[PDB]
Amino acid sequence: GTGYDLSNSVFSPDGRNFQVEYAVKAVENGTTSIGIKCNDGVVFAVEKLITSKLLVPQKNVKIQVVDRHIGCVYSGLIPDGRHLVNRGREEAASFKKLYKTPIPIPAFADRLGQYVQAHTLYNSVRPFGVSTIFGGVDKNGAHLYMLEPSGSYWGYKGAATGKGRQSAKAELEKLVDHHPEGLSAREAVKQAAKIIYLAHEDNKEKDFELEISWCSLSETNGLHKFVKGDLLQEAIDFAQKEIN
Amino acid sequence: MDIILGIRVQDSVILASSKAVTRGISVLKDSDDKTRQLSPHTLMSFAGEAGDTVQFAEYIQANIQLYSIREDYELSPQAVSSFVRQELAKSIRSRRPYQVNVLIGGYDKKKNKPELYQIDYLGTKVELPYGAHGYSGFYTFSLLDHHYRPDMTTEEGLDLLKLCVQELEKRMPMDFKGVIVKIVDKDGIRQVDDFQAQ
Amino acid sequence: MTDRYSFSLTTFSPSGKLGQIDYALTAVKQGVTSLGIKATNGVVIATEKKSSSPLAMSETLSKVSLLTPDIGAVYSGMGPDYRVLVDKSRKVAHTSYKRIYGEYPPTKLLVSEVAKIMQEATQSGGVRPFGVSLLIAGHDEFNGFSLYQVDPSGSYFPWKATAIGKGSVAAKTFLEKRWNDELELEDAIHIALLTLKESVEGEFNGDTIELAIIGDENPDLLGYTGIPTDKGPRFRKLTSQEINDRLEAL
Amino acid sequence: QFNPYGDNGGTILGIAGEDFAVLAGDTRNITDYSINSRYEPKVFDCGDNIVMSANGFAADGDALVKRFKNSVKWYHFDHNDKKLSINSAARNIQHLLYGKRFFPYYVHTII
Amino acid sequence: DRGVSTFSPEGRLFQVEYSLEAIKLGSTAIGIATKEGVVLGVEKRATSPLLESDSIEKIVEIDRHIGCAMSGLTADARSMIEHARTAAVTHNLYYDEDINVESLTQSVCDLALRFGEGASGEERLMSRPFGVALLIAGHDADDGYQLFHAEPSGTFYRYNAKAIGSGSEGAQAELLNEWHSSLTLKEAELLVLKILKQVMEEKLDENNAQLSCITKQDGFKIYDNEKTAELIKELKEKEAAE
Amino acid sequence: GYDRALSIFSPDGHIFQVEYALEAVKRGTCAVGVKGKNCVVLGCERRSTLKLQDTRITPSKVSKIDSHVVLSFSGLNADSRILIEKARVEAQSHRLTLEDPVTVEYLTRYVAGVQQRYTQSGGVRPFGVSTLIAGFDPRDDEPKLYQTEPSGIYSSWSAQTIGRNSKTVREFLEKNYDRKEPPATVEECVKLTVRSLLEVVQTGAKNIEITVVKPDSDIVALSSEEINQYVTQIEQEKQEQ
Amino acid sequence: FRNNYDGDTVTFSPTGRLFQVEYALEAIKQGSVTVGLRSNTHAVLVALKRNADELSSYQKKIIKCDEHMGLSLAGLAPDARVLSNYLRQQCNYSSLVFNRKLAVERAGHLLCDKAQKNTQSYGGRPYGVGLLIIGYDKSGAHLLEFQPSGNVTELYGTAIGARSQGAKTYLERTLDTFIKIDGNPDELIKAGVEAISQSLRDESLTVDNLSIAIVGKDTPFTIYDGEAVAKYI
Amino acid sequence: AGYDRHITIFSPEGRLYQVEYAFKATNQTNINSLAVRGKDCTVVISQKKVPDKLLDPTTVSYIFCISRTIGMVVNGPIPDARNAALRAKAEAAEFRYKYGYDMPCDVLAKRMANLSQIYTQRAYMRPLGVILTFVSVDEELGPSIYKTDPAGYYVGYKATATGPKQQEITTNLENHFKKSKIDHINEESWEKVVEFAITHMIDALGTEFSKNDLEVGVATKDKFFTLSAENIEERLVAIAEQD
Amino acid sequence: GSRRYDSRTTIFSPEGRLYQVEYALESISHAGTAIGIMASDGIVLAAERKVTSTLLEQDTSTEKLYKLNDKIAVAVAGLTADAEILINTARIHAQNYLKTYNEDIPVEILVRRLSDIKQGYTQHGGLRPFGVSFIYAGYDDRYGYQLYTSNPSGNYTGWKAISVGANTSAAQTLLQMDYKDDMKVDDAIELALKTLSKTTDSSALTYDRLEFATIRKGANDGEVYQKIFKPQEIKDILVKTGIT
């Protein structure tokens, strides 16, 4: 019969969880966000749809930091993203309390992965309406991950989710092919700005604000920092030049 | 300690309890009734810790009255004493035990025979022709071993208790201000209001 | 999180039928045929090892299980539901009996404990009944040899001989003809191999058939010597060779 | 064995007038034979025209004043910014003190 | 089925909105607040002549300075009155003063939305909302004479005059024209008694209708049948005048 | 564990589980209570679906809460035992703490409070029981008669009936009971109780039980013959006309 | 469609929506209008209170959280009480433990996380009230708009409730004017009164109807009602 | 009545549809995997499919290292796979701490199958839509293959296969063991046992592999380890110089 | 959530009836007939075994007649497993009373307590009621020989002669026809066998399909004795009564 899409943990006749697939629809509806892995770090960028002139510029921060080396950005239901980062912050602090060393990125990825997957096992809980792009620099190199409402995550050379994910993925694939030797942290910030502007065409009706963050071993000492001031404007100009 | 006396004769149980309530230096009350009626044919006297003594007695009284209404039936003096023993047996291993020693005197309407039970705070129940708690037993038991007969009438038993009280007034250091005497038989429970000079 | 299923999943229908029990019994009917025969000096329990794949090792899957050194059990229906019941039955034999009386429970009491576990899976909140019927054979000092059948409802009956599973109707009819109250243990094993052949479609040998007996004490299976009162377990599983030798005299 | 209590000395003084009230107190904080501070305020303004000082064990004194100042704050939140009267404050402090009856604030408080 | 704390497409709680319908079936309760005092009046509504009408308790005392009237499922009010009486006495114990009428009403309304089958917030152990509305009337030194209308929704409004129950819609429209900011205590007494007579199915007498008032001097006082009967006679003579 | 809200509001402002609980009362055997000048009488009818019962041990309809208070009911027999037990425990608890037996009003207020609690608690259904609580206040000779219902609402009556055909017997009492002159004698108070039952019972000497409560813990239940003498006298009143 | 997926907050729709959250947003639009606006020194809350009858009182809309923080409500009053009391505790926790005035931005984070927990778990319901939080901290004046969905946004000026679009369009146009009203509380309030009058349709804002609150550089959060708002009518 | 296919309760036929649909979820990944026993080693081969170019291929894995000795390959969605992987690792560590020796392959399989049974009986827990294959060289049983499923069923294998094209690989292995008359691959070194597993994988599926198409896990005495892309490359060169 | 699958076992019908209680009574009406008859010198328990085979061991079988106390015994109609749960708790309650008061528990108190447990499943818990009807045969020093019955509703009544299970209407009519107040146990044994033989759904009433128990106070003792009849003892009395 039917009704398999009403309850969360219910398997449909084809072995699918529809409540999870319905949560992905909330992500696809959301704002576009990207992540680029470079030669010694990662760069996160997010679109910020300006609804009206009443919004205070450079205030409504979307990119969140976990611990001191991990940066998180998500698409879809913003409150659901904040809940996941809050859990991640507790999970990162729990690791550091017992093991002294800050939580590794592949370790942190599993910690969020198990927590999101847990919300697909019970009908009393709702799946997360967010896809989270996160990463940082640890003991052995940089890592980039993208998490799904299903709990599925993988390592990425370049990640993209949201409204204009297709336009972003196409631009990210161009970078992987043209740069087999590896992009630099300086180049990744400029390129992330361009990709967001090009992915904005799927939402070109509304004006937007750009927000970039980066974690590089040579540039930021392996700590997560926001791109501010001159470097931010340099990236915006690089994007505004190549949009025409 | 307070004086709690009990004697079972031919057709009744007689309980004698001291009237004095002393706190430290002063005798506050000289007319205290250290006994509670659990049922129409069962009476329980008590002595021990200042607060625990009345609190335990009223708690037992409430449970027996609750059973009497639920079943529309009076429990036998044996069944009541077994209930009291178990309550004290649980108490001794709790956080703060009841330090109460009780004498249960009742008339079994089914057997048509009087019964007397002695239980301490530990939960040690024993059936006796005569019983006393505290230091009263040190004077009275030898008296009752000498003068007691099972076929004695209620009047004979009252005379024997009179002989016990006179000894306790002579040899004991504490002034217990006399005793209140109650009779439990087939007709129920009545108080001897003339024991001051019987 | 938290089990929000605090209500019963098995309820009384307008007709008076308990649906989930009836359907659990339907699942037993689909299961492979297992049988049990009680003799004068022993009890035999047997079943077919339905190999899901020829690559799969049938030895690593025991359908006949030891509960106590004197009590054995076999099933028909759902494998996983049986396996967890065995673990629960083994533990309840210690916790509810052996750790109190210093000895293993009699057959009738261990069966009663298994029945309680299965009964609770019928009434308790947020569970389904066990999709298995069990045949429990055992021996104790004061009852002798006995055989019991436990159902998904929690109901249990003692038997002289019975079968459950696929062709339970046809097997019981054949058992009624061959059973008498003067059978020896070897005679009961002989009839067991005769009755089980009618249910088996493919190969009928010591590798496809699982058989165990509750008979005499085995001091060779005890593992230690010195205590006169300890004489060994009465439960013994027959090896692949021991079955084949008796299949030649079929 | 760990002793949770201590003594910080000092002395406070409260005199009521016909239309005024004073609450004085020395600014010296000490421990045993050593001086901790020559200026450490002991009398506090708690709002609603009420002054308070708890003298004895400094840690318990600070905790009590901090709990009372916060009790006045919540009194405004729950009762439409009503001014806490001196008799209402006194009754409230009783419950603050008796709340820790079996682990007392080691102070002599005056309002 | 459906949750007890489920929202409607209009933005309302089903169980709360259905609870208001139960109050609409209840007996009429009218309150009028004046500068001399607040007057409360209810309809007894006896189901049978054999029923002792004086046993009907729909106006209760919370404190000496606070009283309230109930309408709807009167059995649901018993725990609310208990909480109100406790909160008033507990405040008197903590602060050595009388509790404000606004503060008392707020404490009662803090129980209203405490319903659900496991709502995430605290521990709301109640299967359904209360089926009763309250008319909390009193006096304090800060705001003077007050009249509050407590709902099962958790919200409370202050009124100069309010009518709740069966004839609530017609009685409120009557209160709109009759009320002014200079009414005396006696004027409000006949006014409640007049409007009750209009909405009541039975003829108004001292047995099926009860009056009460809260003043600064005497406090909350329930009018006995002899005192009420004299006011009904006075109200009848003043209506027959013109 | 189980906290599913069974008793809930409906579109028209009704709680159906409480509404159907009164329908269970309408099914149960009729119970009537009348108060005179110095006594209260409780009368209950007995079912006749099966007749081979042992009348000695079969639980009677009128149950004593305390030595001075009694309780009769209508509806489910299983639910009533829980209400009676809770009332009996509270009766002893009041005697323990207040050092004074309960008033009829207070005991009624408790039983009604328990019933109301079951109408807004999760995982429970309301009691299918309406009760009649009668007796005398400690050291008081004024008769008392109260009624509770599944909804939790309680009130005092001069005369009240509950159960099956309670609509018919109430009409009788409404036109036979006068508040100016309540049955001043125990005899005429019992007569009015039997007369009201005979409107429903339809010739039942063994189907009518009468219990009389008097001041100062004086409760007595009438035997079959005692009640039969009233029925015989009442049947003559009709025939002499 | 909608009827099958609006039973509880735990259920997503095929399009990826939460209807129980969306219905909770409809409770705001039913509520009375309230306006928030700020400059570089002060922040003002102008709230239109609603009366049930002409005999009823105009229910309070502005709640004080701390000496430097406060908020206005639109929708369910008890849901506003729960969230404001929580924000009262959080402001109090920061002052007692850290001797630190809670930042207005962080106050919005705390209200976001608490409202989110009701939108993911079964049994619970979303809050049915929109909130406008103002405050002056270490980074100047602030204004935040809270939504039952959990979404909190920092704004220069905004309005929520019935007919709130009229006031919001005005503030979007007057943006460059009221942002520069520094060192003058009266003119910032008058700009908010001119904003709330743009949403008027039924009546005109009167004495016992108007509610104004202000917090700034040298102004602790104070609420003005009745006689104190007469010079702004 | 029609909710018998929504929760784990019995249908009129005595079936559990939620368990049956959990079995169907195992083939969602479209990945085939086989397991074979050597003379003193156990090898697992699994298909590795990386569709997106943006993915880091090193992170894409369905073979998990449970303990020092035991390895596990999974057929089904990765979130449920990692859920079962974390639990198996937690159970393996606890067993060693409590009982003083490394958990055997069959015991871990039984424990994980018993947990799968609980989701089959209890209503609030959904069954994990994954098939787990445990492999190790036990200190008592030797080379071991044990496989669990959503039903709570488990059994030992001489050799096994799992996936969409499971039947084709299964019959291919069957026919080899019917020919060889032995239950294992008679070879000393593990490299040739890996080579055998890749060869019979190619023959059954009818598809050629590159070094990035496969995923290998080798279990030996006291150690389980996974082969890198270059380790598989060396193995693919050896089978090429035979065909 | 889980609300969807809730049967709501403890709810009233529009008429004022309890669905699950009514359907549990329907379940018992198909189970084997159990009869209890009280005589002037004892009580007789008789029960018909439902579903029997030639290979069914009867010697060790006990499905309907259970021993709670040394003075109290029960007849079972309905689910055998559900009965044993209630029987176990009844045996414990009997021993708890003996430990507390040093006296054997009066018959009614044991019956009421067991009935109150059945009542609990009727009002709260959300679980199904026990599909069991009991016939209590017992003796105490207060009322003497007593016969009680209880059903899934939690209601209990006293009887002189009563039947539970299948064909109760037919069995009760035959009992009401031949019962007299001055009956002897031997007469009551005969009545029980005659009533069962006429209400049996099978061909003939044999010994292997019957369970028999008598509670008499032996005149040559002065104490109450319970006698659960053996397979041979049932076979004997079947011939003597004229059934063979």
Side-chain angles (χ1 to χ4, degrees), chain H residues 121-141:
Chain H
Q121 199 163 189
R122 300 204 75 88
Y124 88 107
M125 289 288 278
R126 70 158 180 92
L128 290 162
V130 286
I131 294 162
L132 314 167
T133 309
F134 300 96
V135 284
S136 77
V137 183
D138 189 51
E139 61 174 317
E140 291 192 49
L141 298 180

Side-chain angles (χ1 to χ4, degrees), chain D residues 28-99:
Chain D
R28 174 180 276 185
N29 189 290
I30 53 92
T31 299
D32 299 317
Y33 276 124
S34 291
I35 302 168
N36 298 332
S37 181
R38 298 192 187 270
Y39 186 78
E40 187 71 35
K42 205 144 63 204
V43 189
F44 299 98
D45 186 20
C46 301
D48 290 5
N49 214 211
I50 303 161
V51 287
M52 183 190 188
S53 191
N55 190 224
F57 180 50
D60 279 357
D62 290 344
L64 185 72
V65 173
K66 203 172 188 178
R67 265 163 57 88
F68 176 72
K69 279 187 178 182
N70 196 218
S71 191
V72 182
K73 189 189 178 183
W74 278 93
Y75 184 79
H76 296 301
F77 287 140
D78 291 313
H79 299 85
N80 194 228
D81 289 306
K82 188 185 175 182
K83 188 195 173 183
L84 189 75
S85 57
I86 197 79
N87 69 302
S88 297
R91 182 66 76 87
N92 184 234
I93 296 159
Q94 172 176 51
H95 283 84
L96 291 164
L97 287 162
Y98 203 87

Side-chain angles (χ1 to χ4, degrees), chain E residues 5-13 106 110 113 118-120 153-161 172 175-176 179, chain G residues 2 6-7 20 23-24 26-27 30 50 52-57 59 76-79 81 118 121-126:
Chain E
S5 58
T6 305
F7 268 114
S8 62
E10 290 79 34
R12 294 184 190 96
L13 298 168
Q106 181 64 282
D110 281 346
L113 283 188
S120 299
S153 59
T155 57
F156 64 99
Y157 270 87
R158 188 191 173 182
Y159 281 85
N160 289 125
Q172 194 67 36
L175 284 163
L176 256 289
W179 188 90
Chain G
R2 196 176 71 175
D6 69 345
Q20 280 290 299
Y23 297 162
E26 198 69 43
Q30 200 184 134
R50 183 180 281 173
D53 294 74
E54 265 60 48
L55 279 57
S56 72
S57 69
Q59 188 177 282
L76 290 170
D79 288 21
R81 175 173 164 82
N118 283 246
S121 299
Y122 169 74
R125 61 163 189 88

